[PDB]
Design a protein around this nucleic acid. Sequence first.
RNA 1: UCGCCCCUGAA
RNA 2: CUUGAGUCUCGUAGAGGGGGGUAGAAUUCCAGGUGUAGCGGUGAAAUGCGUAGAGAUCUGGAGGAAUACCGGUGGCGAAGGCGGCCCCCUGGACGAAGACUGACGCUCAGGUGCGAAAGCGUGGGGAGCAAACAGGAUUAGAUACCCUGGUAGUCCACGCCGUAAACGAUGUCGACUUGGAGGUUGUGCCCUUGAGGCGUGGCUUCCGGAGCUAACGCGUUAAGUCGACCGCCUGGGGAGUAC
Lengths: 166, 74, 70, 135, 128, 88
Amino acid sequence: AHIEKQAGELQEKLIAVNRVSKTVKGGRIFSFTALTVVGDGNGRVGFGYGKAREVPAAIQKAMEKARRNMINVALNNGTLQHPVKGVHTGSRVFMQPASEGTGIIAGGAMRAVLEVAGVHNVLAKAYGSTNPINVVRATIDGLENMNSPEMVAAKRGKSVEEILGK
Amino acid sequence: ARYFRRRKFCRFTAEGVQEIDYKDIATLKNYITESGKIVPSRITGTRAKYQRQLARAIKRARYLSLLPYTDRHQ
Amino acid sequence: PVIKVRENEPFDVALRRFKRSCEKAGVLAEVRRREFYEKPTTERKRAKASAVKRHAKKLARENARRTRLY
Amino acid sequence: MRHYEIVFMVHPDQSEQVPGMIERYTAAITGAEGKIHRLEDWGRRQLAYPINKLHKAHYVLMNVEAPQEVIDELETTFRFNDAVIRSMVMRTKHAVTEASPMVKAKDERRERRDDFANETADDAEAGDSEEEEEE
Amino acid sequence: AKAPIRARKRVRKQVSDGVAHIHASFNNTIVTITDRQGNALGWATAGGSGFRGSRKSTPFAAQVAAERCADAVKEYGIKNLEVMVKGPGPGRESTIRALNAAGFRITNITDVTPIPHNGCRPPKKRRV
Amino acid sequence: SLSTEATAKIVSEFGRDANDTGSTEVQVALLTAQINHLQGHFAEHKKDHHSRRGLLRMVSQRRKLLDYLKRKDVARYTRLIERLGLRR
RNA sequence: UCGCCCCUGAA
RNA sequence: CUUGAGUCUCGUAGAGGGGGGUAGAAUUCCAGGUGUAGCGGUGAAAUGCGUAGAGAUCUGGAGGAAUACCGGUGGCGAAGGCGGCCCCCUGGACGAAGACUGACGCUCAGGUGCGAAAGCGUGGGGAGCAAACAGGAUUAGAUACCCUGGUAGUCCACGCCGUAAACGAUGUCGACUUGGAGGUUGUGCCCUUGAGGCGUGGCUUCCGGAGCUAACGCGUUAAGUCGACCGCCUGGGGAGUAC
């Protein structure tokens, strides 16, 4: 994709951070992996999974890859414009728009991912097994998938032209 | 010309004939194994429909002692 | 392993190993073992699994045939 | 009623009895609202294997339409005749009087390219008349 | 090899022909030459040759037995075979070939072999 | 079994006319006729499971049609019953 | 083809 | 009213169901013949069987059970399930022109019927195989796998029990949504001048797109996309046990 870490407006942030393992021929190795997001407070948000032998380069590489998995989002107000109740992976995702005068209200991944993405008055919820790692798939289920007033308005405008043409 | 309404063949070197199969010593003996066994269809190359038709005829004639079925004690 | 058809010519070794293929196929080797209906029928469906896959193999093979690596 | 097609195996040395035997059967069939399409034969062909011993056996065929009532009595005879060896009967499918492999064997005999015997051809013609005489 | 010799007291049962019975068993090999009148002339087997185990069915074991049998029919004067190969084990051309190479020739290849239509039920046998 | 002859008789009797070609009346009629003598086809046998299943379906079907008939014309339904032997 | 079991724990 | 459903007509194919006949092969028993010191089994062995003549081999007779090949993701049935051949009685499916009925339909707790195999009762039958059982072997032990025998049973008739990884681990019905190749079975068309060339239905495998799924994969015969109704689940062990 394209950069989401941009001078004078960058909004670096992290999500997960942990270690994972592979069982090698000898002993067992540890790969320092982590999820990140850089925002701008205006959308443009992504995610990356680094692999490293150290925690700093785990976040380095994950923010490289964050820019390579940027998704665009555009909105008005401090809240998302459309509810998306879609589910990606086995973590169940829900997402309402909500009037200003309320917080993010979420302790999971979607506390921080729903901050960087220019939203902070959104109300969201999740069901199913607790697992922050795929709460992050609310990139798919709300930011990537959306509707906007001028999208729906051009449905109503497309139809009129066809009747005239015949 | 047009509207003559049938084919001139139903014979092939691996696909059988149609519309009549019946008991009679002569005809049947060509389509069975020499040991009084019946042919496999995966060798001969016959399709199901040919095989079913032949089978019926074979077995009837066989148990009228026209085709052998004693070859392990003959 | 033989059939009732005779060989009447001088031989010391004669063809009788494709009279084996006109008799035996494991049909004298099923007389010391019991099986269920399930067992041999599933095996028949591995010899028609061979035949459908035969077509599929040819597409894969064609790419290899282009290049020389043998 | 429907077609029927009694093929049976007589004793090969009681083959001279055959015309008379047939006549007894055929007459009853006709009288029961049947019909004799044609009587056919297949002579004393050499058997593939012994059925009730023997080195050869007589064969004979019948093409008849008859109600089941008579087909009963006919079967009874055979299954209590020791001269009659095996027996079989086929039915329906129009009639196999003409244009079948059984007929093909018969056609060769009349032309004198005989499948089995000169005598066997003559018996078929006799039965169709129903003026049969023993061989 | 180690096979015994055999001989018979009759020389009056000949017809100059005899059935070569062979039973090529997975655990043994029998070779018996019966006359063409259907009455025994000679017989021999692998275990009587002296073989033991599953080396009674082997090619070698079949040959030795075919030749033991040959000694038991030579005195009648027989020189034609009506080979009846049967059983599933080896020794099925071992015997044939040995006979040919022993002053006999083949004349007929016939099949007399048990083929069941399942009028009896098989045993389980080995499972170790 | 029902012969094509026996069919045509039932068609001529039942229905509004003759040569109805399958009308509610004739439909029930045909079924009835079969069932009655297939009682004797299970009086010559014990269990004959597939054929038995067949019989049951015909009984069911006969009743279904009758149910519509009382909701179409009472007079018609009553009349048909009298002429038939099955009505349970 | 030659049967053949048994094995306290955190790096 | 006819698009749903159903009937009528004409054909089509099949191991659909039930009943009764019939053929041969194989094993076995019994009888006779031939021939003699082994047979059989096994990784080796041993028990067992043989001079009172076996094994094998040949001839005659008898009986029980099952039908080699056929035979294939081939076919049929609601499912369970169903294989030599023939007759009788009988069910279901599908297609083709038309013709008719006119929502008569769909599903379903209860209820009712059908149930592989084992089992049980009653009566027939008994070859082979085989729980049990008895020797032998392997093993430290071997109440087993292994070997030699072998009883109940398996088999037939009738009734009963109703279970199964009763499986596609996939409720049933209706409706839709890319396709490709094969299999199978109807039917229309095409110098049918090609066993076939082009269609169009029914059923059946394999592949795979989108989509779905946690993934494996499923994938127009869905685990896709919808509706209708019913059944079930709601942590594991305790327990499909107790009461």
